[PDB]
From Swiss-Prot, chains A, B:
Whole-protein residues included: 3264 to 3569 of 7096
Active site as annotated: 41 (for 3cl-pro activity), 145 (nucleophile)
UniProt-recorded name of the protein: 3C-like proteinase nsp5
Annotated consequence of substituting residue 145 to A: Complete loss of 3C-like proteinase nsp5 cleavage
Residue ranges, Cytoplasmic side: 1-306
Mutagenesis or variant effect for residue 189 to A: Does not affect ability to cleave and inactivate human TRMT1
Length: 306, 306
């Protein structure tokens, strides 16, 4: 028993982290086979960042201008190209610790593990969700750029996120590993609005199932609701619409607990309308929306990797 | 900016996890040099667990009775001994991935990372605190026994916790790596009372400093208090006494923010007496006590390892 925010084991990603320096800018790179991937603003001075011409800047750079370090060892750069917002540095050494890997573009509402790094050295690991407005609520200081987000499916690392920038109120934005931003952001230090964030309804329901599995049952009411009536109430509280796809995805937790999804929806409607009256669910005074149905099953069934 | 519950990177511990089986009981072991450490109840059937005679049970066991697997590879056991509540299995192969390591006995109020494992395979990593009543609030299913808790100081893994058992309400108890239980527990399936838990005052103050560093300043009041007057108020709310040692340990956060510890104590006294009035601190509706002053500094200064 017990329910914790749990990250994937980071060992397979730790072996891929390097330091990339170009003049006075140092940040992190991801070393897979004979390529290092890093944010392209490594080639910027502080002033460049206000309105960078990345092509004019990369044009003046030679391979030797990129100092890449894996622990002590300097890796020699033998080629460089820009793909959208990421630099690819070809190196003369293939990483011997390259795991099986994929580049994936994750969907809003899905979770991943972040391995926070400084100067190419891992600092810590934590789980976060891609918010409906394509930001994440991370922990990132100066030096963390190039830190990556990932999921593990048995032996395969799916890299989904590379860190680029911070937005108002300690929210974070970055790219997939093809250098395409999540959301309407550009890698320039100029005013840009994030859309308003919403609550990930399917994830709150997954977490209420986790609560029941753990014996926290006080919020279960005797009622049911229709999908349409549930969605009308939750829209008022800035919850995303629940879809039949979501109902189908909650199927395993529904079957394990014997609680129909629409019955759990009636219990959530009452929490939204009446609040929690000073009670906690799984130790929390607020409704949690950063556990997916698959995260709840994985954690409540003991799914392992490697 | 941003503040997350962050675990240590787990790579150095992942390389040490093995599976240990003796008849029908399988759980996890820690493989360091040519020794595997695991909970001694691996030698128990379900019935044995009600009142085990570990010596009578281990007496009937030969080296071959222990099946140890590191991934696919079977490791041959060449010796076995019991030290308090842990079995030490001598194996004919020293682990090539053994990191620099220490066995430490952590103090109540200190945090560590748990690498949750099933069948010798890592499942996930999360941070937790040794509670004042010598339990932890973990996430552990059947099969998780032998999972370890650790801290990393640059290159050195300090192993502090090995998982043995679950207590009423999904709280967890285990041993140091010399097999001595934290708290008044024995490895028997019979009634045992945990002492009442308390709130780790020094950790709540550390977290209020993290909030200020992140710009969440609404709870700062214009007052100060004495250590004695603070302790009289907090004792009512089941907070542990704050000591001068604690005041000294909060020194770095106090100096960084320019807020005297006793001024922050006056702000905590007002939160305890009046509550939060529906406001959040760092996204939480409750006061958090599982970040140490060192965890706040580490996370807010970007301390790395390896
Ligand atoms: C990254 O470059 C690194 N070296 O770590 C850094 C990471 C930042 C620093 C603070 N926390 C982080 O996550 N990224 C940047 O400095 C990027 C970089 C330049 C500005 N920038 C920002 O993150 C800024 N944000 C920003 O301007 N936000 C807007 C106004 C667009 C909403 C700032 C102010 C430094 C946090 C570029 C190329 C985007
Ligand atoms: C561990 O053996 C494993 N194989 O994973 C297992 C871990 C447990 C199972 C559920 N969650 C966990 O953390 N440990 C045990 O089964 C230990 C073992 C036998 C009983 N036991 C327990 O944890 C029990 N707890 C218990 O009896 N609690 C008291 C009454 C002492 C407060 C139980 C009921 C199975 C959870 C021994 C030797 C202690
Ligand atoms: Cl909360």
């Amino acid at each position: 028993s017990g329910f914790r925010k749990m990250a994937f084991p980071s060992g397979k990603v730790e072996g891929c982290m390097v330091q990339v320096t170009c003049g006075t800018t140092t940040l992190n790179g991801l070393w897979l086979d004979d390529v290092v991937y890093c944010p392209r603003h490594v080639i910027c001075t502080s002033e460049d960042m206000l309105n960078p011409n990345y092509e004019d800047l990369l044009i003046r750079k030679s391979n030797h201008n990129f100092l890449v370090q894996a622990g002590n060892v300097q890796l020699r750069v033998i080629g460089h190209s820009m793909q959208n917002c990421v630099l690819k540095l070809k190196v003369d050494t293939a990483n011997p610790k390259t795991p099986k890997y994929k580049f994936v573009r994750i969907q809003p509402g899905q979770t991943f593990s972040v391995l926070a790094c400084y100067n190419g050295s891992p600092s810590g690991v934590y789980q976060c969700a891609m918010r409906p407005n394509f930001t994440i609520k991370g922990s990132f200081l100066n030096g963390s750029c190039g830190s990556v987000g990932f999921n593990i499916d048995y032996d395969c690392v799916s890299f989904c996120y590379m860190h680029h920038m911070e937005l108002p109120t300690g929210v974070h934005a970055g790219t997939d590993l093809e250098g395409n931003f999540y959301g309407p952001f550009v890698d320039r230090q100029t005013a840009q609005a994030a859309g308003t964030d919403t609550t990930i309804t399917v994830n709150v329901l997954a977490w209420l199932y986790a609560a029941v599995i753990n014996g926290d049952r006080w919020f279960l009411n005797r009622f049911t609701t229709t999908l349409n009536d549930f969605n009308l109430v939750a829209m008022k509280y800035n919850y995303e619409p629940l879809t039949q796809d979501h109902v189908d995805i909650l199927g395993p937790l529904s079957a394990q607990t014997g609680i129909a999804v629409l019955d759990m929806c009636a219990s959530l409607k009452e929490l939204l309308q009446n609040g929690m009256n000073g009670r906690t669910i799984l130790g929390s005074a607020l409704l949690e929306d950063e556990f997916t149905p698959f995260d709840v099953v994985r954690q409540c069934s003991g799914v392992t990797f490697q």
